[model samples]
Target chain A: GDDRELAILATAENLLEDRPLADISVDDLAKGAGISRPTFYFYFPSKEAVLLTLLDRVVNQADMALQTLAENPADTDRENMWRTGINVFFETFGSHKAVTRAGQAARATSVEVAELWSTFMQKWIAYTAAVIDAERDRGAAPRTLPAHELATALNLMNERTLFASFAGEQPSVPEARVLDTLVHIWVTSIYGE
Target chain B: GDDRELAILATAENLLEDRPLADISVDDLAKGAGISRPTFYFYFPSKEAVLLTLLDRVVNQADMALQTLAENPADTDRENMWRTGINVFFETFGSHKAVTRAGQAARATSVEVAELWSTFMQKWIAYTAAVIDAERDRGAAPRTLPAHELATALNLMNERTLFASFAGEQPSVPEARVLDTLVHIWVTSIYGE
Candidate 1:
């Protein structure tokens, strides 16, 4: 049942609070979830695989919202689409903070996973760049610079800022303020304004 | 004696080629250097300490060159200064590529170390921003934007390009061409042209 899966994910998150994801054994998670060890293995092959599952779920949900935004970018709701994307990202991961932290730890231990994640990020940047280019074409934003560069910068901001937030180094400004500053930098740099 | 120290550094560099600096045990390093493990410990407390020593040696040496350039802003040697700095940086790390690679790996592992590295980066950005401010003051370069923004942009180039080169994934551009393109980005963005 879905309840069983939620129990497993909850156990994984609880374990992440005290230790890195790599240090948590399947047995530990299973025990926390009131399940047998073999059952945990039945549900997931390896720790990284579990992490990949969580990552996939989060990214898929985010992608759906992005797709929707991409389809109707001219809507008044689009003014804060980038900001909303960031907010949704933080909120989604925040829901399962332990799981997200564990997933990061899992990625660090596995080079293949890290490479896969980088490729995923590259795709995200490309997608966001396309949306931004479309907005530029609509005369809603400046198009003086290449979309790829702006995309790269935005992606870097997401990477850097998320990591910063994760490490508990809260930004000097509010979260929205931080996003505003980043957007201002983006618009200013690309538009020569 | 200095040659022996350099020899140890060279061995550390070779070891880095095979594995991350953190992964290279002190015993492995000493064995490679034909020295006892205790003797290696006498020279450095831990692998990270050794890395910090090497980093300081490289960064400080380049800092001297930077100091000289900073003193003579009227030289209009932005190209020369930038090229020399980039070359020195890459060459120094190239000599002990393992050390730099290890540093990056360690950075990804230890958030505290990553924070220290980011603080160091912020310092460099502030310093560069001052230079840009000085350039604008002298009417050598027009200041259309805040120096801090320009500093952050240059910092972005430094990190992104160097990471690309280190990972052996630098784009198709040759070294000189890559540097030229980066410099063009800096000049154009800062001048608002």
Candidate 2:
């Protein structure tokens, strides 16, 4: 249990760098971890479980970006705060762009990925909406769209924008404009000009 | 070339109302069209082609909504302009939400569907960015993110939000909040407070 289970995860992480999650197999995972296939199954039942674990690692780290808002400061700080918050979120995925893309793409095929992604977004919306609600209460922002609705919209924006860029899909957003664009949308949507 | 082709499109559209495009087979389409399976092939090469044709129809109608933006007027009209434009766009998709969802879902499996969706978004961004660029040039809005980038981000937002609502995916945005949140976002992101 010491290093073996962690080895399996580390191996999957490394392998995903060069391939899609769907491309990797249990035999590859077992061999990469220097363990037999049965032992690999002992640690994780499915590759998706490993992916769920991996996504949890990244998302948990990204979730800490919200800690930037802990102080709750003056009016001028909102845009910078949003920028920092979104930048941290982007970088966390930035570091694991392939894994993030694979996991998101895998959602169409995996219940665990879809379920975890669903739960994660639900929590993200709740947390983000709370922040927006606080800002509005302080007269830092106007009340137009409901806090939850705006939060959902913004989060959906972030998810798809990030994925589309990673997949190099159409409306191809360059790295130069990605974070700035998200910051602009988040700031103006939540706090207006 | 006449009603026969239109009937195949109509039949596929009707079938999509009940299930996903993937769930509907060629035989289902053929039967729904009231024709032999071979006749279906004679009329359309594949079901994805029918979906592409269907999406093309909805998207073209939605594209004309930009005509509302043609008679641009006073400065105070910006928000209403965006709202009307987005509403018309949303309504076009809303009337065929099932078809929209099916075709979008079909993209993963069909190269033609993906290519068409890609071409559609590229043209949409070009058209949308031109409007934003014009507004910025007129001093109607600020120039922060490049017009193309902002347009891309907003269009991505609109696409995902609409798809998630149709698929009943997470964040589970209800219809009421969808259009308003999008309008607020487009207005604020483009024109500021």
Candidate 3:
């Protein structure tokens, strides 16, 4: 099941490179993958379904990596859990540029899809909030305003950078550099000099 | 020529509430306005031409308002300038939500149209940048990371709020209160208190 699905996804990703999600037909996908139309339906109900599935898988991987980093803070030698968490996120998105681009392109086509994207972002924000909460418990997080605002800022940067990348513009610096800039902004804004 | 052109735009605005731009045929637009299709063509070469013309007109209004704020800073206080600027933006968007929504909605359908929208946004950003530049010249404004970053944040908030309003989920907070909240965040972040 995994091979068949992976094969289909790989073909779909290639199709996306040449044409947008709006123009790609299920029949084209099935033909490219050497599967019947009904067979494609058996694996994925809709084109959007394929994208959602891929994103779900990637997000799961990111979550697992983040959880490991949080649990074993010494392995990465990072001083704080928040920094480790962002490192994990950057690694995940950095490796999967094509899938990320396709997902954003598809989301742009429909308001319902865009809302779904935002919902996923909300969950990601919640994840960031969890990390801040852990840091606060250890007396490392800022006391002013709230930890949720840090999460909000993180989510905004994540979405903005992701969209910018999809639009074919790279971040001015490396991913790690960008994360450093964000953390600095957060630290200064949340805590007094 | 301008009067007849405005009449077509008025008719298009009325029709936009009921039909999406992509769904509206040239024949339908002509019939609805009781004008011949060729006459419609005389004013606008294509449907997109009409859309772009309307956008240009609204953008011109926004530009004039921004210019006045920039040139007559002594006449209007800094806080009052922001209040007036934000309100001018909101009211202009509110009055023409249908046309505005249609333009954004159409962006996903055509690359050329999306590029047109991007160009308009770039011009708006320049105007916003000028306001920030002027404020920085005055001793009242604190220096930020970079002028462009501050401008980007302002545009992000304004665009996000506008989308929320267009989607019928405008916040219940008073408009002035929202403006104050944004200004507070801006000042706090820019000046590391």
* Residue A165 C-alpha lDDT in model 3: 36
Off by over 4 Å in 1: A22-27, A76-108, A129-150, A169-176, B1-5, B61-65, B74-97, B108-112, B129-161, B169-193
Model 3's i-RMS, to one decimal, reads 5.5
lDDT of 2 by residue, B140-171 (tens): 99887888989999999999997888678877
Clashing pairs in 2: none
TM-score of chain A of each: 0.78, 0.89, 0.77
In model 1, state the lDDT of residue A137.
85
Chain B, candidate 1: TM-score: 0.78
Q: Is the docking of candidate 2 incorrect, acceptable, medium or high quality?
A: medium
C-alpha positional error of residue A17 in candidate 2 after TM-score superposition, expressed in Å: 4.0
Per-prediction DockQ: 0.20, 0.65, 0.20
How many pairs collide in each candidate, listed in order?
Answer: 0, 0, 0
Give one digit per residue, the lDDT tens place, for model 2 in A1-193.
8599889989999999897776799999999999999998899999988988888888777776555545554355778867766776678888887678767766776678788789878988898899899988999888878899899999999988987876778767886678888988998888774
Residue B124, candidate 1: Cα error in Å is 1.5
lDDT of 1 by residue, B1-193 (tens): 5655565676777777787675788887777777888877777777676676666666566566566656754444665655555555556555655566566556656665565566666666777788778778888777565677556545655555555455554121233344544454455455553
Worst 10 residues of 2 chain B by lDDT: B67-76
